[PDB]
Amino acid sequence: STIEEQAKTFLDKFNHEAEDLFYQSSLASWNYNTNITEENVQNMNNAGDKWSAFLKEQSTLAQMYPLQEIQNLTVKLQLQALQQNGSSVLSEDKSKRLNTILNTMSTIYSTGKVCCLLLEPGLNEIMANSLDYNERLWAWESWRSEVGKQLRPLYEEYVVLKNEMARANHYEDYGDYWRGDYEVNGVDGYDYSRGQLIEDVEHTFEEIKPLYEHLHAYVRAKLMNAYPSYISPIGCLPAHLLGDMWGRFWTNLYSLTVPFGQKPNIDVTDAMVDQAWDAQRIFKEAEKFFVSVGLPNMTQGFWENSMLTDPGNVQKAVCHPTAWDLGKGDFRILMCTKVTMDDFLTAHHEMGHIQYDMAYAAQPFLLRNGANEGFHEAVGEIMSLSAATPKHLKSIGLLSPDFQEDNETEINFLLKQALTIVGTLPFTYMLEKWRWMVFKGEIPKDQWMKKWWEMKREIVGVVEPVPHDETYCDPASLFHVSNDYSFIRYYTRTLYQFQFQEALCQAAKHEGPLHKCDISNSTEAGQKLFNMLRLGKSEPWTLALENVVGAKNMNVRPLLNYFEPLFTWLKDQNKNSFVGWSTDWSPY
Amino acid sequence: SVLYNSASFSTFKCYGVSPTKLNDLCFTNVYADSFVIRGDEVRQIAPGQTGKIADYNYKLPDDFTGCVIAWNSNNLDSKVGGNYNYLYRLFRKSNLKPFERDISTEIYQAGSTPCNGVEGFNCYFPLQSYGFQPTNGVGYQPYRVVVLSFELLHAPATVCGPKKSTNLVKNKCVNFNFNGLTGTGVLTESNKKFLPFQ
Numbered sequence: 001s002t003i004e005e006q007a008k009t010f011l012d013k014f015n016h017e018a019e020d021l022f023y024q025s026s027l028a029s030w031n032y033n034t035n036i037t038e039e040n041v042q043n044m045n046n047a048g049d050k051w052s053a054f055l056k057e058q059s060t061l062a063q064m065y066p067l068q069e070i071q072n073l074t075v076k077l078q079l080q081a082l083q084q085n086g087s088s089v090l091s092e093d094k095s096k097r098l099n100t101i102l103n104t105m106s107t108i109y110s111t112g113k114v115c116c117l118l119l120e121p122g123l124n125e126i127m128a129n130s131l132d133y134n135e136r137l138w139a140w141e142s143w144r145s146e147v148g149k150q151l152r153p154l155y156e157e158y159v160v161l162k163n164e165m166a167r168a169n170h171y172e173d174y175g176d177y178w179r180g181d182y183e184v185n186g187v188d189g190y191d192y193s194r195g196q197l198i199e200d201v202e203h204t205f206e207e208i209k210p211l212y213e214h215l216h217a218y219v220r221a222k223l224m225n226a227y228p229s230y231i232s233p234i235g236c237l238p239a240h241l242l243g244d245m246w247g248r249f250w251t252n253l254y255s256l257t258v259p260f261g262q263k264p265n266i267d268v269t270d271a272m273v274d275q276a277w278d279a280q281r282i283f284k285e286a287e288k289f290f291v292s293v294g295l296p297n298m299t300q301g302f303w304e305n306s307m308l309t310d311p312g313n314v315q316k317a318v319c320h321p322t323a324w325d326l327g328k329g330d331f332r333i334l335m336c337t338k339v340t341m342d343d344f345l346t347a348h349h350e351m352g353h354i355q356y357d358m359a360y361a362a363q364p365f366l367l368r369n370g371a372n373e374g375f376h377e378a379v380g381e382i383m384s385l386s387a388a389t390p391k392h393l394k395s396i397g398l399l400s401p402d403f404q405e406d407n408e409t410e411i412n413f414l415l416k417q418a419l420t421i422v423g424t425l426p427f428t429y430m431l432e433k434w435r436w437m438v439f440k441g442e443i444p445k446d447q448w449m450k451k452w453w454e455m456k457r458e459i460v461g462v463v464e465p466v467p468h469d470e471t472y473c474d475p476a477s478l479f480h481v482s483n484d485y486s487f488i489r490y491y492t493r494t495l496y497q498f499q500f501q502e503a504l505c506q507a508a509k510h511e512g513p514l515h516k517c518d519i520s521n522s523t524e525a526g527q528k529l530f531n532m533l534r535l536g537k538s539e540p541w542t543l544a545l546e547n548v549v550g551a552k553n554m555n556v557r558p559l560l561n562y563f564e565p566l567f568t569w570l571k572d573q574n575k576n577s578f579v580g581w582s583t584d585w586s587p588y
Numbered sequence: 589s590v591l592y593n594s595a596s597f598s599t600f601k602c603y604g605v606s607p608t609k610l611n612d613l614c615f616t617n618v619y620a621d622s623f624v625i626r627g628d629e630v631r632q633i634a635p636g637q638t639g640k641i642a643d644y645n646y647k648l649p650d651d652f653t654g655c656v657i658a659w660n661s662n663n664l665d666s667k668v669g670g671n672y673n674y675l676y677r678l679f680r681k682s683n684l685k686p687f688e689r690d691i692s693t694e695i696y697q698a699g700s701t702p703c704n705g706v707e708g709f710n711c712y713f714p715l716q717s718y719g720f721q722p723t724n725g726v727g728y729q730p731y732r733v734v735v736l737s738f739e740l741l742h743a744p745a746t747v748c749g750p751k752k753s754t755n756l757v758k759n760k761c762v763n764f765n766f767n768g769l770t771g772t773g774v775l776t777e778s779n780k781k782f783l784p785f786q
Contacts, residue, residue, distance in 0.1 A: 006698050009712060012678060016716045020670055027723075061709070305723055329725015361725070362628070 003069040010065070011078065014058055015364040019327050021051045022365065026326040033334050034307060036316035059083055073186045074538050078366040080185065089168040090161075098161045101154050105482040112147045112477070114139060128243050128252035133230055140240040141466055144474065151476040156445070159438055166439075175436035178486050181372045184540040190552060192542050201491070204556040205429055211563060212426055213580045214570035215418055216461055221577040222257045234578045235585040236457065238465040246478060247427060247462060250419040259415060259569075263408045266390045269341045271398035279339055280309055282347050285397065289348070289387070293519055294526025295355060299331055302354075306332035321346060323353040327368065331357060345384050352383035359533035371541040374492030379533070381497040382504075392518040407565070410515050414566035421494055422559070428491045430459040431475065446470065461581035465588060498558040499549045504529065514562045589750075597659040598731065603635050604653025605738070614748035619687075619737035621646065624665070624674055626718065628727030630658060633735070644680045645690060648735070658733040662722060666730055671720035674730075678714045687737070 028043035062083045070076040088095050112119055117126075123139060130136045162174040171177050172194075179194040216237075223241065224231045231237065243252035287298060311317055319336035326332060331354050337343065356379045360367055370376030386392065390413065393399050434455055437443045443451055449470050456462040480487050501514055508522035519525060532544035542552040549555070560567070589611055592600070605613075623646055625633075632639035635652040642648060665673070679696045695703040699710035707713050720730040758775040 001699060006710070009679060009696075009698050013712045016678070020717070020719065024670075299725055301723065301725055328719055328721070329728050330723055331725075361727070 003066060004071055004075070007065055007070065007075045007079075008072075010062070011075065011364065011366065014082075015366060017054070018365045021047070021054060023326050023328055023330075025051055026324060030324065030326070030332060030334075033318050033320075036318065059085065077186045077537055080180075082366070084169065087165065089165055094161065097157075098165065101158055101161070102482075102484055105151055105154055105158075105476065108147060108150050109477060109479070109482045112143065114142050114146075123245055127240065127245055129255075131226060131256070133227060137240050137465065140245065143245065143477065144466075144468070144472055147477050148473040149471060152471055152473045155473050155476040163439060172440065173436075174439035175432075176440070178373075178488055182374075182541070184542055186540055187543060190540055190542045192540070192552070200553055201429070204495075204554060205426075207556050208422075208425070208559060211560060211567055212422070214567060214574055215422075216581060217574045217577045217579050218570055219253060219257055220581075221574065223253075226256065230587050232585070233576070234582060235587070236461055236463045236581045236583075238587050239462050240465055242462070246474075247460070248424050250423040251416070254416055254419055257415075259411055260408050263412065265409075265412050265416075266393065266399070266403075267341060268344055268393060268398045269339075271400070272339050272344075275397060277339055279337060282337055282344060283308055283351075286348055286351050290351075290355065292521060292526075293529070294523045295530060296358070298355075299329065299358065301329065302331050302333075305330065307334070308337055310336040310338055321350060323350050323357075325354075325357045325368065327365065329361060345388055348387045349380045349384040352380035353377075355379070355383075356533055359530065360536040363536055363538070367536045367538060369537060371537055371544060372489075372492075373486055374489035375496065375541060377489065377493045378496040378500065381493060382500045385497060385501060386504075386517065386519045389516060389518060391516045392520070395518070395520070410565055411569055414515060414563055418563065418566060421497070422563070425491070425494050426460040428487060428494075430455050432488045432491065435475065448473075457581070457583040463586055467588070492554065495554050495556065495559060498562050499545075499555060500529070502558040502561065503548045503550075513564050514558075515565065591657075597657060599630065599656065599658040602655035604651070607655060610655075610738070610749075612749040612751070614740075614745040615738050616740045616743055616745040616747070617737075618747055619735075619739070621735040621737065622732060623735075624661070624730050624732050625676075626727060627725075627729040627731055630731055630733065633658075633733060640678060641676075644677050644684060646735075647684050647686045647688065649686045652737070654736050654738045656733070656735060658731050660729070661732045662729045664730075666720040666722055668721055668723060671718045671730075674718050674720070675715040676718070678716055679712070680714065 024047040025044060028040055028047055031037075032040035032044065059082060062079060065079070067076060067079060067083075070079075087098055090098070110119065114123065117123060123143070126139050127136050159174070166172070166174050166177040169177070171180070176194060179197050182192060182197060183194050184190060184192040220231060220237055221233055224233060227241070231241070239247065243250055283303075291297060307319075310319070317336070319334050321335055324332050324334060333350055333354055335343075335347065335350065337347070353376070356370065356376060357368065370379075390399075390405060390409065394401060394403065394405075434452065437451070438448065449468060449472055452474060453464055453468075475481060479485075498514070501517070504519055504522070504525040505514055505517035507528065508517070508519060508525045510517050528548060531547045532539075535544060546552055592607060600607075602610075625641065629639065629641055631637070632641050633648070633656060635648060635650050677690065679698075681694075681697060684690065695705055695707065695711050696714050697703055697710070698712065701710060703711035718730070719728055721728065756775075761772070761774050763770070763772045764775065
């Protein structure tokens with residue numbers, strides 16, 4: 001008959017049964033989050049066992065259908081994630097060995113006590129608020145001498161197992177398996193090979209480097225008074241003086257670095273108490289925001305099924321910020337609604353994630369996900385960034401049209417976002433690139449710690465306060481490594497956050513920098529955003545990116561136009577310190 | 589007259605004829621086809637649309653001159669946990685005709701090998717289940733769709749419509765109509781009687 005005709009019939013048979021099994025595994029997890037009981041746990045394991053058993057049977061029968069026999073340029077993109085074998089692609093003897101390491105690394109990282117002390121926010125508040133050299137150093141050295149030593153034999157075997165597992169599915173190494181998500185394998189012409197991902201990232205990172213040099217020199221010169229015999233103006237910065245155990249979140253360093261103390265920052269906490277929000281609100285305000293952009297209105301079951309209240313300590317609940325997608329038109333958000341300032345921006349961030357799921361509602365279950373791992377998170381970042389503008393929050397309900405603002409107010413806003421958005425940008429470029437050389441085979445097995453400290457002083461600028469050896473291990477102790485999560489998705493999230501913001505603010509009759517753009521009463525800027533959201537995975541990310549930005553390759557120019565007033569002020573201020581960081585320098 | 593202004597149906601649309609002219613119009617045969625479907629597949633039920641419902645299940649002609657009655661039934665035959673009381677055929681090896689009920693219950697043959705009724709390779713099961721749950725969206729709720737077909741033939745139609753009857757006034761030279769006869773005169777009292785069949 002026809003191979004392509006029988007391919008669409010096999011998809012309709014799987015989609016009519018995948019939505020029922022996936023909903024039962026998600027509905028049982030929602031009951032455990034509302035009320036922590038010992039019964040809802042067994043309901044999710046029983047519903048999840050039928051999903052893993054049915055997916056394996058359908059993946060075997062899909063191997064008989066050829067992949068090249070697809071002319072619709074849609075079925076080929078769906079059978080790629082269906083014909084996979086997962087971690088069980090190797091033999092039965094090495095199957096339990098790979099899954100055991102995933103449980104040993106997650107147990108030690110979760111039970112990592114320093115004697116006592118918990119994990120989060122156990123060691124996070126010690127490395128942040130301390131202001132002492134003989135206190136935060138003991139907490140950082142004990143974590144690398146106890147947790148890293150127990151995870152050293154497990155990290156060595158993790159590279160050899162993931163290398164053979166990736167090559168079994170026609171790849172190159174572990175780092176190459178994550179490149180297939182960004183690879184175009186559908187519509188011709190707009191292709192994107194895996195070899196192109198090696199370049200571009202390395203070219204755009206050099207143009208953003210002068211922006212990081214002016215930021216690193218200002219923080220080093222500011223904290224020099226706190227550590228006169230430890231922080232040199234021409235030296236570098238240790239690994240424990242970054243306000244984080246792994247040097248990821250640098251927001252805590254803003255309290256000890258204030259460029260203007262005479263201009264208070266914005267605060268929407270007191271504005272919510274005056275107007276009396278029922279604590280069941282916030283979402284009502286968040287609803288009219290997307291209407292003025294032009295994105296369609298939300299569903300009806302969202303206001304009757306999703307728990308938008310806070311039960312408190314009298315009811316066991318785990319309202320963690322995570323967007324759920326049960327499917328079949330059901331959309332629920334798990335979040336404790338409070339009357340604070342952080343919850344106002346957090347609710348707008350997760351509201352953009354559930355909006356993406358409402359776009360491809362009519363699409364089958366195989367098309368209910370973002371184009372790649374680094375694209376679904378970028379949808380919510382542009383919603384919280386546009387809502388965090390002090391000028392946008394003034395022309396609405398909260399805040400006072402009486403609060404004055406000028407050029408000095410925008411300096412404190414760009415510097416605060418520079419320690420979170422672009423602050424962890426050099427760390428992502430170094431952490432993911434260092435692992436690609438180990439998973440492929442460019443770094444020997446006895447040169448992991450040697451090359452680790454060499455790339456720090458050339459990308460981020462972090463020296464070692466303690467001369468470590470070879471048995472130590474640093475990247476093994478991480479929430480994303482112990483849980484087997486990709487870290488390259490956070491790099492594209494930062495770049496795509498400013499590219500989508502510049503496209504909407506340009507058509508909304510607004511020029512100049514992007515620190516005062518207001519997305520309001522702009523129908524043209526709202527209809528263009530829905531073009532790439534309704535498609536989903538039916539079209540490649542290179543084609544969907546041109547419909548909004550205008551190019552298929554990532555750009556760094558919009559990332560610089562947002563921090564233009566910040567980069568100008570740092571030029572006429574960092575004249576007493578050294579622009580950059582030194583490599584041949586040690587605090588000890 | 590009581591079906592238009594009932595204020596209780598979710599979707600009440602008519603095609604071909606006007607919804608206000610069929611109240612007194614005579615009809616020979618008045619059919620009634622009831623079927624429960626999803627909430628998003630209601631748009632496929634139209635004289636001029638196709639899909640997986642109007643092709644392999646209930647097919648309607650393109651020149652259908654009638655009305656489409658469909659109301660909300662979410663709080664009736666719908667439970668939480670999965671609906672397993674309604675089925676539907678997905679694919680079929682032929683195309684049905686308008687105004688025809690599905691009788692043959694066979695297995696769809698996608699390939700070139702016989703299935704012999706048993707489900708196997710290249711022998712998918714066409715009868716699938718729905719998902720009528722009160723926690724889903726709008727396009728997943730059940731809607732009882734009732735299609736009323738109007739067909740007129742050469743036989744004398746016995747189903748027409750009620751006629752609005754007014755009052756009776758005499759002592760004037762006005763116009764009146766007493767079943768067929770339309771005369772204009774003064775209605776006075778009489779002493780003679782007629783026959784009980786004239």
